[PDB]
Amino acid sequence: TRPDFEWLNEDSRLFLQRGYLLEGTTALERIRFIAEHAEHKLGIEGYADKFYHYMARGYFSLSSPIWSNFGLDRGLPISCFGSYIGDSIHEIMVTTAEVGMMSKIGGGTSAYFGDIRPRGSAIKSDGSFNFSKLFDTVIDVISQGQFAGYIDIEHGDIDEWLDIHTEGNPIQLMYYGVCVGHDWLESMKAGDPYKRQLWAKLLQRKTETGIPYLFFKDNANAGRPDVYKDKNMTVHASNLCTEIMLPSSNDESFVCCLSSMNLLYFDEWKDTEAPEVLTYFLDVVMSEFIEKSKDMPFLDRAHRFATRHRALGLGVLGWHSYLQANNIAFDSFQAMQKNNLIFKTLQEKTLKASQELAKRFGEPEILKGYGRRNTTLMSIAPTKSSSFILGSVSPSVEPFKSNYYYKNPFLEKLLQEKGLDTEEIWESILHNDGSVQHLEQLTDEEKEVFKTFSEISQLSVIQQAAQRQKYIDQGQSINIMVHPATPARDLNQLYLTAEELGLKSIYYQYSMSANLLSCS
Amino acid sequence: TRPDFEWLNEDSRLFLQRGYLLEGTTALERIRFIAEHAEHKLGIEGYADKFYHYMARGYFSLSSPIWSNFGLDRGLPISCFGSYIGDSIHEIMVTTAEVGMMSKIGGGTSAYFGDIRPRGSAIKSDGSFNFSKLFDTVIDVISQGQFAGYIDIEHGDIDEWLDIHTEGNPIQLMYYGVCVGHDWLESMKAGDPYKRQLWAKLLQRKTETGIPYLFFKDNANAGRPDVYKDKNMTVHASNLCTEIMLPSSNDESFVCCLSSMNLLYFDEWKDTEAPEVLTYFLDVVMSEFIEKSKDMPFLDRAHRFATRHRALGLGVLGWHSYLQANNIAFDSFQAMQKNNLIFKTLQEKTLKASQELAKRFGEPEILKGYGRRNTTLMSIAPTKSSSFILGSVSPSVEPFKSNYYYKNPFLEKLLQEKGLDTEEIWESILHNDGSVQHLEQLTDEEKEVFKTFSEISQLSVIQQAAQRQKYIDQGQSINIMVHPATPARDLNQLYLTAEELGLKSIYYQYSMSANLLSCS
Numbered sequence A, B: 001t002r003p004d005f006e007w008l009n010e011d012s013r014l015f016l017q018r019g020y021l022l023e024g025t026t027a028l029e030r031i032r033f034i035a036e037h038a039e040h041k042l043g044i045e046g047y048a049d050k051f052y053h054y055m056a057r058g059y060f061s062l063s064s065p066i067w068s069n070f071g072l073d074r075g076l077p078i079s080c081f082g083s084y085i086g087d088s089i090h091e092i093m094v095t096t097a098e099v100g101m102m103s104k105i106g107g108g109t110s111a112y113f114g115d116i117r118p119r120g121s122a123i124k125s126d127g128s129f130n131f132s133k134l135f136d137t138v139i140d141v142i143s144q145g146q147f148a149g150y151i152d153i154e155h156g157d158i159d160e161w162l163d164i165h166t167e168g169n170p171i172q173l174m175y176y177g178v179c180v181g182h183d184w185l186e187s188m189k190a191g192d193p194y195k196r197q198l199w200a201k202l203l204q205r206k207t208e209t210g211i212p213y214l215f216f217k218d219n220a221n222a223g224r225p226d227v228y229k230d231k232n233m234t235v236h237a238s239n240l241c242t243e244i245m246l247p248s249s250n251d252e253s254f255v256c257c258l259s260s261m262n263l264l265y266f267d268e269w270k271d272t273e274a275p276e277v278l279t280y281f282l283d284v285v286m287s288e289f290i291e292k293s294k295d296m297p298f299l300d301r302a303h304r305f306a307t308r309h310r311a312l313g314l315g316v317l318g319w320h321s322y323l324q325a326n327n328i329a330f331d332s333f334q335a336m337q338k339n340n341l342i343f344k345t346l347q348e349k350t351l352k353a354s355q356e357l358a359k360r361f362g363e364p365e366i367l368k369g370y371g372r373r374n375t376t377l378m379s380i381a382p383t384k385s386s387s388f389i390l391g392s393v394s395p396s397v398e399p400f401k402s403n404y405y406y407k408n409p410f411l412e413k414l415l416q417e418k419g420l421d422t423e424e425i426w427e428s429i430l431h432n433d434g435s436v437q438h439l440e441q442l443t444d445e446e447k448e449v450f451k452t453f454s455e456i457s458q459l460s461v462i463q464q465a466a467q468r469q470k471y472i473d474q475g476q477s478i479n480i481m482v483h484p485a486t487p488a489r490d491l492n493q494l495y496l497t498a499e500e501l502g503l504k505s506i507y508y509q510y511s512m513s514a515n516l517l518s519c520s
């Protein structure tokens, strides 16, 4: 019934033309080229037509670097770049040049600052915040930039980092994350007054700005694949969007590529080879990064990482879409059942594919004897533009912001079956911030299915992330949305619950205009 | 009569202890070590005792990097570092990392920005001023920094550079110079209104701030040694202090080392081997830089330059001191006679020494078949601290600021012979900004000999620099001092005369508190 490329409507074509495609290349032409180029690099007969078919059915979203650069001379097809900053000017300049080159090329960058000695240390040093000014300037000066720096909450310079983005502060452009350990938080909860005041200030900053990001470093490291545990490959920090969980060091900067399965069609593709085909595709994308980076000035640490690890980040979008297509409320037991099923299925299929890839092409150095091609397979990145392109489905695992901001097609259908598909009804929804909770014509059950992100239990967001985390070898970009009237006490408990449940990170805390945190 | 090391008085010892010497090394111990280390590297018997003797007599000043680092593990013994910035992010990052590493190590840095495409060029670019923000931040963040950027007056972005240091401007820390060609200035003088307004603005900026530096690029290139002309090795820019005249390129960053002859004792050392010994010393200093830099991250372009060129910068101090010791007024025909004699003698002796060095050790690559060891031998750097250390003699070729600010020892002697060496007389001099022009007890002849920098013809400063330039293969750091009441018209003519007479640069325009420009 659904035509091939239904998703590729006039909105999507325009978006792609204006953003990603070279003048004189159409969207369809580009998809065919990508499919054929991948087949050629894999050496697998029939691969292109399989990949093309799955594209045609709307099962795959490809990352913007892949749309822009895959199979072409320009740019790189990677979606993150994470550097470790050693405690020396030499190593600071190495990272500076990486960030510069990547800010020109694009795909976001990040770095770990926590091993830089703090302000006042003998060399007297100016500390880690002082060096953050260099990266903030690099991205101010060079663009295609976006950069995130990570600092430990126990670091000598934490107070300086907590004023990033405040009025007049030197740092206005770069983002940051704070690495927070289990023992530190247990000391805070047990009553330590300094930790209690620092934590309070961090929460105040996050309400005011959305940031810092939180990196629960002990959850991240406890959740690493065995290979990284076996070889003491510590995850110091995450990436620009907080979903990546890969080790960086003096000799290696993590990189990864991404593309995403459209969960709207889970019941169509769950027993197909679509996830495996996408895994194969991401592996050839990494082969391209390796080939392109081998002679690229300043990218030697990333070239090394990609060569030895071959880390991939296959993600998802359309989670809320899938739930709505099945008349399931986001915060429900039935949603939790589907969450387990979907992510279990993806874990199994992507791992199987990585095992087959090692049989065909060999294990990279870090995985010799481990039996797969890729150190990691899955990560749940944000997908705002990618979701738009692919039929305006819901972003990643996030609830729809609202029903009308774009009209929710499942709400539309429901309104049509009730004869309520009228300008007056829709205008009422627009005037209520895309909510339907005001509408007396809808049952409570129907209202539940179409709650907005703001109306949904934020505890349910966290719990669902915790539930699926066991099936995801990297991480998940998890946003929450909180009313500005929310007591600090309630935010405090939500973040503490996040760490307790094993979440490796939290991304942005969004606000809205003037029980959702403590019940699900 | 004069004791050995008379110059090394308690002031000098304290200065050296506090600035340059490692805890537990005395000034004398350091001098002996430097002499012996140089002998060892030259393989020349008796060299150390010759070098030590000349140090003992007060004939030599050594640069602060040499005092700090020569023969030791730490740092580098070079006094400039000049990079060419190619029009690419890659080449911008190469230069960024050079400047970072050198800002930690010390010795000043500089770079040429003029081949960066201007704001609005297709890639649309943000231009050369945008990239200057990166270097300004590097030196804000890393210290031991000082940096000077050079831009051509005809460059698309010249208006942006001319607001450097103004209220709120992004650039407050780095210095800059403007490269001004002969044909451009002839177009300006012939009446071009745009050039006339731009030149007027530059002069306004220089009165207000002292800067930009002026680099007369056609004089600099016309004055290069034949070897650089023969091989099209363009001098794009000068260094932090405007005395260096060396080529930089995509593959080479200029470096040079310095030390200085004390002209107070010219009549003692003119027929000795002291200038030759100092030349030999500077060549072994460059051998140290080469050895140290060979495995230093990010310094490959400077290592290459030093290896192939072996450029040296032997300078002078105590010019005004020499004139005063001989009862010669700075602005006089007799001064001009001495200027010619001294600089002719130095040109001959340093070149002879470089020829002998090539016979002993070989010609470097750039000079194969040219018959000397070093592409350049002489440059007249500023010597404010070095002059203090060496008996408080006058700085470089500059007049003494004043007679009492430190008491002029020739004025003191003159006052003693007249019985005028009294607190009342000296206090009168202090109250008149170190001038003696008010004192009725002195003849006009005596007053002439002890005019302050501010009282001296600035045309004479320029003319003396022009006269000695024929004997100096690099350049000269030339400051002038101008009353704030001076009409723009008169400054205009002075700078135009500077270019007409063949000066390769001008450094700072100093001011003072409320015929000297047009007569000598």
Ligand SMILES: [Cl-]
Binding pocket: A079, A080, A081, A082, A107, A108, A109, A110, A239, A240, A241
């Ligand atoms: Cl990143």
Ligand SMILES: [Cl-]
Binding pocket: A225, A226, A227, A228, A370
């Ligand atoms: Cl494993």
Ligand SMILES: [Cl-]
Binding pocket: B079, B080, B081, B082, B107, B108, B109, B110, B239, B240, B241
């Ligand atoms: Cl320099």
Ligand SMILES: [Cl-]
Binding pocket: B225, B226, B227, B228, B370
């Ligand atoms: Cl020559």
Ligand SMILES: [Mg+2]
Binding pocket: A040
């Ligand atoms: Mg083929």
Ligand SMILES: [Mg+2]
Binding pocket: A236
């Ligand atoms: Mg650690």
Ligand SMILES: [Mg+2]
Binding pocket: B040
């Ligand atoms: Mg020996």
Ligand SMILES: [Mg+2]
Binding pocket: B236
């Ligand atoms: Mg040129």
